[PDB]
Structure formats: C-alpha cells, structure tokens
Design a protein around this nucleic acid. Structure first.
Lengths: 45, 45
DNA sequence: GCGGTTGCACCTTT
DNA sequence: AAAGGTGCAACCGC
C-alpha cells in the first residue's frame, strides 16, 4: 500500500464513529482510516 | 454535514476507483470523497 | 475555480 | 516526555 496523505473531508461525529469502529475490529485508529476506505471498495467490489 | 479537511491516507489506484465509483452514483468526485467513507458506515450500520 | 495533494501544527495515547 | 494519531491551511493539477 502506498497510502499518501490526502485532503479528505470528514465530519466531527463521523470521526469518533470511525475510531470506535477501530476498537471493535481490534485495530489502531490510524490504520482503520485506511482500512475503512479500502474495505468500502472491498464490500461492493 | 460539517466535513472538514482531515489527514486521510489514500492509495493512488484507490483514489481512481473512488472517482470511478462517483461516475456510477452520478456524483462529482469531490463530493464522493466524503460520501464514500460516510456510506461505508451506512452500509454496515 | 474546483478538485485534489503535501507537510506540518496540534491533540491523543503509552 | 515522546511517539502515534489527528486538524487545518496552502499549493499545484485539471
């Protein structure tokens, strides 16, 4: 993966939700950010 | 929706797929960036 | 101008 | 305190 830092726009409550999801999947929030978008494409294919 | 510019890491091909997905949903790539992540949480709830 | 990209300032966690 | 994770503003590309 060559995940570069991009200017993605996220909401405040959505931020916490993403961090909470990270705990559920047993992954670090920083890692989960990349996984969330990547898995999004994985779910629909 | 108060989507603020945050530091999200995205891969090159992932970015292109995001744009391609935007075309499928009939939305502008700029809008789809924040919609994809938001919809991700919407799909799993 | 709009869309997207980069590095760094600041807040969170060990 | 430090390292990791995060927020914001600026610049280049289309």
């Amino acid at each position: 993966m060559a995940t570069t830092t991009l200017g993605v726009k996220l909401d405040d409550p959505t931020r916490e939700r993403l961090k909470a999801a990270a705990q559920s999947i047993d992954r670090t929030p920083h890692w989960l950010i990349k996984q969330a978008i990547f898995n999004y494409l994985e779910k629909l294919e």
